[PDB]
């Protein structure tokens, strides 16, 4: 979706300039002037509130990665303890 | 010679309309731009003032120099239309 979105608008913007270079009339502008300004609607960068969204998004990843470390402790606890139990037991009983 | 005044009073009735504050896009329409070339350039320049402007107090007065009638009623409406027109262009520029 990313890369096909790159070459989509690329070749589509290649048609945007090619139609102005060759093919006139016209195609400019039944929609050219308004559509291209819709492209110029949002640049869209900070300052300001977009900086607040940054560390807020950082505050969003907090919980999920915190939970990630929680699953790490639970998965490591259960699997490692139980496996070493059944491991050391099978070795000491058979050997 | 007919279409120069035709697109003139068209530019008057279209610019003085309250429902359309600018519509500077269709002011550039290619079939009417040759009709605007025959027209005097004070109308085209003041249509660029309503295209961008906004003030540009000299051109909005120049259309009062060029067209005496029907402007006296809609003059204050045009001033309100350009005062709300600059708001999009100041954040867009």
Q: Does B31 touch chain A (CB under 8 A)?
A: no
Contact, B46 vs B77, CB < 8 A?
A: no
Substitution target in A20, A26, A27, A33 with the highest count of B β-carbons within 10 Å is A33
Q: What is the dihedral of CA B20, B24, B27, B30, to 10 degrees?
A: -130
d(CA B6, CA B20): 19
Sign (positive/negative) of CA torsion B16, B18, B22, B25?
A: negative
- Asked if A33 lies within 8 A of B92 by C-beta distance, the reply is no
Q: Residue A40 has what DSSP assignment?
A: T
Q: What are the start-end ranges of the H helices in chain A?
A: 2-21, 32-39, 49-94
- Asked if A34 lies within 8 A of B28 by C-beta distance, the reply is no
| B57-66 helix and B71-83 helix, angle to the nearest 10 degrees | 160
Contact, B11 vs B78, CB < 8 A?
A: no
- Give which of B31, B89, B25 is closest to A31, Cα–Cα: B25
Way the structure was solved: cryo-EM
Residues sharing a CB contact under 8 Å with residue A35, sequence separation 6 or more, in sequence order: none
Residues sharing a CB contact under 8 Å with residue B25, sequence separation 6 or more, in sequence order: A29, A33, A34
- SS3 track for B28-81: HCHHHHHHHHHCCHHHHHHHHHHHCCCCCHHHHHHHHHHCCCCHHHHHHHHHHH
Q: Does A33 touch chain B (CB under 8 A)?
A: yes
Residue pairs between chains A and B whose CB atoms are closer than 8 Å: 9
């Amino acid at each position: 979706h990313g890369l096909k979105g790159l070459n989509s608008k690329l070749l589509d913007i290649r048609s945007y300039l090619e139609k102005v270079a060759t093919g006139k009339l016209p195609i400019n502008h039944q929609i050219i002037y308004q559509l291209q300004d819709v492209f110029n609607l949002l640049p869209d960068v900070s300052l300001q509130e977009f900086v607040k969204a940054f560390y807020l998004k950082t505050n969003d990843q907090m919980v999920v990665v915190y939970l990630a470390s929680l699953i790490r402790s639970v998965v490591a606890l259960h699997n490692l303890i139980n496996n070493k139990i059944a491991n050391r037991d099978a070795e000491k009983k058979e050997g | 010679s007919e279409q120069q005044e035709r697109a003139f009073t068209l530019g008057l009735a279209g610019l003085l309309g309250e429902g359309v504050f600018n519509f500077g896009e269709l002011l550039m329409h290619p079939v009417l731009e040759s009709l605007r070339n025959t027209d005097r350039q004070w109308l085209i320049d003041t249509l660029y003032a309503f295209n961008s402007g906004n003030v540009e107090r000299f051109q909005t007065l120049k259309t009062a120099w060029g067209q005496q009638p029907d402007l006296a009623a809609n003059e204050a409406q045009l001033l309100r239309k350009i005062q709300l027109l600059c708001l999009m262009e100041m954040t867009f520029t």
